[PDB]
Nucleic acid binder design. Sequence first.
RNA 1: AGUAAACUGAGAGUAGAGUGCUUAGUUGAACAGGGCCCUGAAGCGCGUACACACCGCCCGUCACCCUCCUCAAGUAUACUUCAAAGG
RNA 2: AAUAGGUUUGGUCCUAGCCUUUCUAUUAGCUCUUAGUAAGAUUACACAUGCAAGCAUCCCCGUUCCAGUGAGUUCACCCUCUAAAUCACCACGAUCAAAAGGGACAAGCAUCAAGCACGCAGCAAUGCAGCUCAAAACGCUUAGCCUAGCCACACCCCCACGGGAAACAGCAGUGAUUAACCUUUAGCAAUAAACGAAAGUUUAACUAAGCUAUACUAACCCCAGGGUUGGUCAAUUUCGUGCCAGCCACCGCGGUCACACGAUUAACCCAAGUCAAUAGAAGCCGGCGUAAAGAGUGUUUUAGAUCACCCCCUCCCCAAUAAAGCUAAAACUCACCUGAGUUGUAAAAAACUCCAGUUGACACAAAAUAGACUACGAAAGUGGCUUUAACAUAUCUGAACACACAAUAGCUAAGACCCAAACUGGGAUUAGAUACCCCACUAUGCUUAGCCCUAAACCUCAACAGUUAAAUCAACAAAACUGCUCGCCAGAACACUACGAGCCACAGCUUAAAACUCAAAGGACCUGGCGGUGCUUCAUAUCCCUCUAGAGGAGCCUGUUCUGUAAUCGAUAAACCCCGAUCAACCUCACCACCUCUUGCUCAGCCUAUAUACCGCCAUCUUCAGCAAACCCUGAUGAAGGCUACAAAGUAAGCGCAAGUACCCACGUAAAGACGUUAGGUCAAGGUGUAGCCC
Lengths: 71, 108, 17, 168
Amino acid sequence: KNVLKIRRRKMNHHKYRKLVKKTRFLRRKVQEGRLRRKQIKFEKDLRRIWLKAGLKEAPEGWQTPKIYLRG
Amino acid sequence: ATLNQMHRLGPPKRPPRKLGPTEGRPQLKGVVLCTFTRKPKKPNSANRKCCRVRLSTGREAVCFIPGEGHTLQEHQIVLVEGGRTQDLPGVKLTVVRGKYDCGHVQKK
Amino acid sequence: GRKRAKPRLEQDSSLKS
Amino acid sequence: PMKGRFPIRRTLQYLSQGNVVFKDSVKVMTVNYNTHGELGEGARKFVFFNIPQIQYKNPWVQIMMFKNMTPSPFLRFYLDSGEQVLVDVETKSNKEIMEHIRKILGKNEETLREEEEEKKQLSHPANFGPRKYCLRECICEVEGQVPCPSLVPLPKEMRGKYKAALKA
RNA sequence: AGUAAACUGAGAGUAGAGUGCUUAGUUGAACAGGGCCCUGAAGCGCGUACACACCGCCCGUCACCCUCCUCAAGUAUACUUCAAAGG
RNA sequence: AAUAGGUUUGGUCCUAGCCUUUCUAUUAGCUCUUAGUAAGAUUACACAUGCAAGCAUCCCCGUUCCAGUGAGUUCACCCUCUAAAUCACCACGAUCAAAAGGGACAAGCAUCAAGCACGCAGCAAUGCAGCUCAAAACGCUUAGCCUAGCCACACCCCCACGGGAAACAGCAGUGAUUAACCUUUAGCAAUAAACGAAAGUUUAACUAAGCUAUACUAACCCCAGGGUUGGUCAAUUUCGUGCCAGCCACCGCGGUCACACGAUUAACCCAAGUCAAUAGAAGCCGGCGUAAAGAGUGUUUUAGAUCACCCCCUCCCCAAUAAAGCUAAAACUCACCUGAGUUGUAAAAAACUCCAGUUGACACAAAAUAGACUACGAAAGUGGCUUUAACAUAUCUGAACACACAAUAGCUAAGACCCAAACUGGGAUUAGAUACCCCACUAUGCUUAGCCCUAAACCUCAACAGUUAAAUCAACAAAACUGCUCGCCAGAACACUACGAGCCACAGCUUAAAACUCAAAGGACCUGGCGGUGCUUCAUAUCCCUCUAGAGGAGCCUGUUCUGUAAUCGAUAAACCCCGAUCAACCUCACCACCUCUUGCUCAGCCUAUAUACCGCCAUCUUCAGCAAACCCUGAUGAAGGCUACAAAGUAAGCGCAAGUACCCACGUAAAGACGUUAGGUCAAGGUGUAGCCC
Ligand SMILES: NC(=O)c1ccc[n+]([C@@H]2O[C@H](COP(=O)([O-])OP(=O)(O)OC[C@H]3O[C@@H](n4cnc5c(N)ncnc54)[C@H](O)[C@@H]3O)[C@@H](O)[C@H]2O)c1
Ligand code: FES
Ligand SMILES: [K+]
Ligand SMILES: [K+]
Ligand SMILES: [K+]
Ligand SMILES: [K+]
Ligand SMILES: [K+]
Ligand SMILES: [K+]
Ligand SMILES: [K+]
Ligand SMILES: [K+]
Ligand SMILES: [K+]
Ligand SMILES: [K+]
Ligand SMILES: [K+]
Ligand SMILES: [K+]
Ligand SMILES: [K+]
Ligand SMILES: [Mg+2]
Ligand SMILES: [Mg+2]
Ligand SMILES: [Mg+2]
Ligand SMILES: [Mg+2]
Ligand SMILES: [Mg+2]
Ligand SMILES: [Mg+2]
Ligand SMILES: [Mg+2]
Ligand SMILES: [Mg+2]
Ligand SMILES: [Mg+2]
Ligand SMILES: [Mg+2]
Ligand SMILES: [Mg+2]
Ligand SMILES: [Mg+2]
Ligand SMILES: [Mg+2]
Ligand SMILES: [Mg+2]
Ligand SMILES: [Mg+2]
Ligand SMILES: [Mg+2]
Ligand SMILES: [Mg+2]
Ligand SMILES: [Mg+2]
Ligand SMILES: [Mg+2]
Ligand SMILES: [Mg+2]
Ligand SMILES: [Mg+2]
Ligand SMILES: [Mg+2]
Ligand SMILES: [Mg+2]
Ligand SMILES: [Mg+2]
Ligand SMILES: [Mg+2]
Ligand SMILES: [Mg+2]
Ligand SMILES: [Mg+2]
Ligand SMILES: [Mg+2]
Ligand SMILES: [Mg+2]
Ligand SMILES: [Mg+2]
Ligand SMILES: [Mg+2]
Ligand SMILES: [Mg+2]
Ligand SMILES: [Mg+2]
Ligand SMILES: [Mg+2]
Ligand SMILES: [Mg+2]
Ligand SMILES: [Mg+2]
Ligand SMILES: [Mg+2]
Ligand SMILES: [Mg+2]
Ligand SMILES: [Mg+2]
Ligand SMILES: [Mg+2]
Ligand SMILES: [Mg+2]
Ligand SMILES: [Mg+2]
Ligand SMILES: [Mg+2]
Ligand SMILES: [Mg+2]
Ligand SMILES: [Mg+2]
Ligand SMILES: [Mg+2]
Ligand SMILES: [Mg+2]
Ligand SMILES: [Mg+2]
Ligand SMILES: [Mg+2]
Ligand SMILES: [Mg+2]
C-alpha cells in the first residue's frame, strides 16, 4: 500500500517536535506554574477533609508533602 | 461483538446533535454591521454580496444576501435563516428577503 | 482556467429523444 | 444473523412458551448441574433451554446455578413456609424435568384460567375513556347517539351561540 | 547505382519577368562492414500518489489573509458551597 | 435506517460519510371564501387596572381545593406498619391515604476512579475496623415524568422563625424580551367544588361566546395561490445575460446553441394553502490482513465458556534465559629487518609520513564456514566453546492502567575502548549543498548498577476448539468457514494534538477530545500516460562509426523574422521558411490615403469573425500493417480477456497491405497506403453552418 497516511502523520510529528523545540523555555515556565497550582489544589482537597470533619487544624503532626516536585 | 460485550456496553449512544449557526432555531434577528462581497472558492467566479451582522444571541456572523441587488446598510435590521452558501466557505446564514429592512428583489 | 466538466457527468438526451 | 447457538431462545415467542408457573410458595430455585457426564445431559439442556422460560414466567423467583459442586445434578426449591423440595434430575431429560416440577410446584391450568378471567373484569366494555384503557372514548361513537360536533355540526337550536341570541 | 556527383536541354506560367519549380537526357563513382551512449521502433517485463496525464502531481519555511481554538502575567467581576452544625 | 435513490475514480469493485424521497411540529415569505370542531406568550423576566372565596342565626367550616407554571428534580410505583379523613354515632371493620421501614426507579461523561466514616456487635459501658466502588461508588452536566394522569414549585434565600423586599407561573390585559405575540366577553342555566338542616348563595373551576389557516371535518353560484420544471425527481418555449449578474438539498450551472441565471411562454405538483429555515420521527445481532478497528508480550483476579471425565499419537537434543570461566580468525599496539612512501576514487583533494611490508608478541571488541538448517523462547530476542542452574499450568478464555517483561535510540554514575560512528571539523561537488562522495574524531554501540518503556514491537493472521461439506470466493494478501471468549472500531481532517490524570519519565511516555472546515477521505484492482525504467533484438542511406558530395565562413539570389512604413492576409517544431505563388512595375490586390456611388455585374453584395461548426483538397506517423461490423467463449455474466501447429477458444464479411496495373521486365521507380494521431493546414480556391455589416 501507499504511505500517504504515514506521511501526514510524519509531518505532523516533525512540526510538533520542532514547535516544542522552539518554545521549550516557555513551556517549562508554564509547566512549573501548573505544578504549583496542582500542589495548591491538592492541599485544598486535604484541608477540606479535616475542616468538614469538625477539626479546626490539621491532625497533630501532619504536614502535607510536596508530591509533584521533581525531588 | 459478543453478547456479553453488547450487554456490558449497552445500547449505542448517539452523539449529541450539533447545533448550527442559528443554534437550533429557524431564524434569528440581526443588526447589519458592514456590507461587502466575497469571492467564491474555485472553480466558481463571482462577487457574492454578503454582510456581517450581530445576531440577537450576541455573536457576529457573515450572512449571504440572496437575489440581484440589495439596499442593506449599517445599523439596519434583518432576519437571517440557516442554509449554507455552497461556494462561500464559512457562510452558513442567509438574509430573508422581504423581512424588516431587507426588501424583496426589485423585478427585472 | 476553463472549466473542464467530468466526462461521467456529461448530459445526454438519447433517452429523452 | 442472530449471535449464538439456538438464537430461538432469545425471542419473546420462545420465552412465553414456558408452561411452569410456580405457586406463590416458591421463592428460590437452585440448580446444581455438571458440565460433563452423560447422565447429567438433561440437566445441562434444562439450564440451557428452560431456565430462561422459567425465569420469564416467574420474574420474582430467584434462580441460582451451581456447576460441578456435587457428583449428580439436582434441583432444590425453597418455599416461603421454610420447606425445601429436592428434585433429583440425574438420567432425566430436560422435558421430563420441566414436566416434573410443573406437577409438584406449578399452577394447574384451571388456576391460571381463573386469573385470566379476573383480569378481564378490569377492562369493562361499557366504560368510556382513552383508547389505552377503554374501547370507546365518548358516547358520540355509538350509532344512534348525537354525533360529535367535530364531525357533524349541531342544529342551531342545540348550540349556545344561538340560544342566547334568541333569549337576548 | 545508371544512384550520388557533374554537365546539357525542354516545359508549365507572363505582354514581359525566378539563381524557383516540373521534366528529358549525357558522363558516371566510393562504401555497404562493425556497433547500441544517443535517436527511434519491436518484443517481453517492472514501478507508479500522474489521468488537464512529468510542461504531471507535490511537501515545508516565510509573506498576506480570514474562521476557530489553546496557553497565559496581573487584576476584576459573578456564581457555587457552609447551619446536613454547636452551646 | 426503506422496495430504496444521488454522490469519490480515467475506469471497476469494495468500504464509507453526506444528501434525496416519507411523516409531523414551529417560525418566515407569498397567498387566502364560509361553517363546525380542536388547540393556542418565546421568556420561573417585570407588571398599571379590574376581577378570581365564600357560606352561615353569631360558633365553626371553607379559602390547605380548583386554576397555574416546568424553575428544581430519581419524595411519583410495590410491600410492611400505621395516623388523619369518609362511612350520623361505635366502627373494633371497610375505604382512602401521610409519616416511618424494605424494594424498585432518566440521560450523557470514567479525561468524575477512588469515596473519606461512608460499617458491625452490645441492655449499657464500650469494643471491633469496618462500609461503598469499573457489575461504575463518589462526582459533573442535561432534562419535569412512565400522561385516565403524576411529580415539583408557588418572587428570592433548597426551608421561611427571620431577612431581602413588596411578588398575575389564577383570568383578561400590558411592558420589556424572542424567529415565536388570542378578548382588559358573558353567565352561575349545566357539571364540579365550598357552605347551609334546607329553600338556596358563591365561584375568571367551568359553561357558552370572541380572536388566530396551527390542525381536523364539511362546503363553495361566484372567486387560487405557492413552489417547481439539468440529474436524483413529476414538469420549459422564446429572449436577455456572457465565469458577470446570479443559482444550487446533493451532484453542479454561468466565457455567445444556458432545458440549471433573469424575464417571458408553457408545463408539473400540491392546494386555501404553498413550502423556505429549523427541529423531531426511522440507528448496535455490523465489522477489525490491506478501508476505522486484534491494542509489543505473558499471567491472573471476580467471572464467563463447553473446547474440562470419557477419548487417544512428538517426553529428551538443536541458536531460550542467568552466572562464571575460556579463545580460533581478524584488528590495535610494540619490537627487529627492509623499503620511501602510505591512505583515498568515476576522478581528485585533504589526511598520514615515529609511514608501509614481512615476522613475533598481543583484547572488558565482534562471533567466517556449519546455516541450502528452521530450532529455542511469552514476546522482545537467541547462531564461538565449557560447565552450573534452568525453560509455569492435567479445561479453556481472562487487563492501556494490576503483576512481570519488552529491539534500537536515549538518560544518571563508574569503567573499557579494537573497529564503526550521529554531531562537529577539514577536502571535494553544486546556482546553493547545513546533503549524497573522501578523511579525522566525539557522544554512542561494550561492561557494571540504575532508569526510560518506544518500533513497519508486523505472519500487517487475537486466544482456544472444530470442519473440509456446503456458496470456493467483492479484490489482493494467506484456500473457505463454524463455535466460544476477551480486546477494539463506527466519514475525513483537526490528532502519535489540546486539557486532565498517572509515571525515577521534566524538549518524555501512556490515556485522549472539542471548536472551525470539507463531500468526500479510503481499500483493492484495471487501463492509459510516464519513468535520470530492466532485458533482448533491431534500424541499411540508417541511430553511431565507416563511404561520397554538400550546408555552416565569402558575395549574390530568394523566403522568413525583426525593425521600419499611412499601407494586406495565410503558412510558421518535426509536418513553415523559392510555402498558397507552374510567380506582385499598372493590373493581379484582398492593403494605405484621398474622392465618388447607394436596389448597387446578380430576385444584391461582404477576401467580415469563427478551419475550435464544416464540405472540398491535404500534411503527418506511413521509410507503418493494421482497422473491423456481425457472432462465439473465458473471468461467478466485475472493469477486462480470447495464443500455443505433436496447437490449449476463437470464427470472421469488409477496408488497408498484398495482388494487379503505369513506366523499359517478373527488377526498380511511380502510383497506392486503411482506421486512428496532431480540435494539424486552408472560411483568402470555391461552397457553406452560426454570428455580424447594409450610406
Ligand atoms: N477494575 C477492577 O478492579 C475489576 C474488578 C473486577 C472485575 N473487573 C473486570 O475487568 C474487566 C475490565 O473492567 P473495566 O472495563 O471497568 O476496566 P478498564 O479496563 O477500564 O480498567 C480500569 C481499571 O480497572 C483495571 N482493570 C482493567 N482490566 C481489568 C481486569 N481484566 N481485571 C481487573 N482489573 C482490571 C485497570 O487496571 C484500572 O484500574 C471487566 O470484564 C470487569 O468485569 C475489573
Ligand atoms: S368526542 Fe364525543 S362529542 Fe366529541
Ligand atoms: K452511499
Ligand atoms: K359555614
Ligand atoms: K422542569
Ligand atoms: K423554591
Ligand atoms: K352553576
Ligand atoms: K433543477
Ligand atoms: K563464529
Ligand atoms: K512485517
Ligand atoms: K503502465
Ligand atoms: K560551406
Ligand atoms: K478540414
Ligand atoms: K471557403
Ligand atoms: K463562412
Ligand atoms: Mg498536518
Ligand atoms: Mg440554499
Ligand atoms: Mg406561515
Ligand atoms: Mg383513624
Ligand atoms: Mg410514604
Ligand atoms: Mg475503562
Ligand atoms: Mg480533558
Ligand atoms: Mg429545567
Ligand atoms: Mg412572577
Ligand atoms: Mg419558597
Ligand atoms: Mg395571565
Ligand atoms: Mg405560535
Ligand atoms: Mg350538605
Ligand atoms: Mg373558545
Ligand atoms: Mg460540487
Ligand atoms: Mg452550457
Ligand atoms: Mg442565449
Ligand atoms: Mg430559470
Ligand atoms: Mg487500518
Ligand atoms: Mg497482535
Ligand atoms: Mg503498537
Ligand atoms: Mg490465561
Ligand atoms: Mg495484556
Ligand atoms: Mg480494559
Ligand atoms: Mg503502550
Ligand atoms: Mg527497553
Ligand atoms: Mg545504553
Ligand atoms: Mg575509526
Ligand atoms: Mg563541509
Ligand atoms: Mg568512543
Ligand atoms: Mg562482548
Ligand atoms: Mg521484530
Ligand atoms: Mg487474548
Ligand atoms: Mg473520525
Ligand atoms: Mg510516537
Ligand atoms: Mg502527547
Ligand atoms: Mg499534559
Ligand atoms: Mg553562407
Ligand atoms: Mg508575411
Ligand atoms: Mg499567422
Ligand atoms: Mg492558422
Ligand atoms: Mg507544427
Ligand atoms: Mg490601383
Ligand atoms: Mg499593385
Ligand atoms: Mg472588402
Ligand atoms: Mg483543423
Ligand atoms: Mg513490381
Ligand atoms: Mg509516392
Ligand atoms: Mg499496393
Ligand atoms: Mg487548429
